[PDB]
Amino acid sequence: MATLLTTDDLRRALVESAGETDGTDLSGDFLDLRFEDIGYDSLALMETAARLESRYGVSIPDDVAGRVDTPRELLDLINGALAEAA
Numbered sequence: 001m002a003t004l005l006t007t008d009d010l011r012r013a014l015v016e017s018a019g020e021t022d023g024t025d026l027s028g029d030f031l032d033l034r035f036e037d038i039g040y041d042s043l044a045l046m047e048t049a050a051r052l053e054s055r056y057g058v059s060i061p062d063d064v065a066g067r068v069d070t071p072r073e074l075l076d077l078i079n080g081a082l083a084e085a086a
């Protein structure tokens with residue numbers, strides 16, 4: 001069953017990939033903002049991705065990783081892939 005995750009869980013899991021006194025306050029919004037904009041490259045970002053992949057049992061496609069500028073689009077990607085996994 002496709003268990004679509006919420007934006008709350010995503011927010012929290014994005015924090016786990018950094019530490020404590022090295023991150024910003026993910027509050028208000030983080031969906032219409034960029035990853036470069038929040039001090040995330042790719043490496044630390046894939047850690048966040050794998051955090052979710054392993055939990056829901058998914059796998060992120062390679063070409064499609066270059067289609068997410070915003071967390072907004074990343075959420076659609078995972079939500080959509082879940083829907084096709086049934």
Ligand SMILES: *[PH](O)(O)OCC(C)(C)[C@H](O)C(=O)NCCC(=O)NCCSCCC(=O)CCc1ccccc1
Pocket residue numbers: 041042043044045046062065066068
């Ligand atoms: P950054 O430093 O540009 O990239 C992080 C990775 C982990 C890819 C780093 O370059 C590295 O050491 N890679 C070794 C091979 C590896 O782990 N590959 C992972 C699968 S292939 C990566 C495809 C991507 O381009 C993913 C990058 C990404 C993901 C999500 C949003 C934006 C960019």
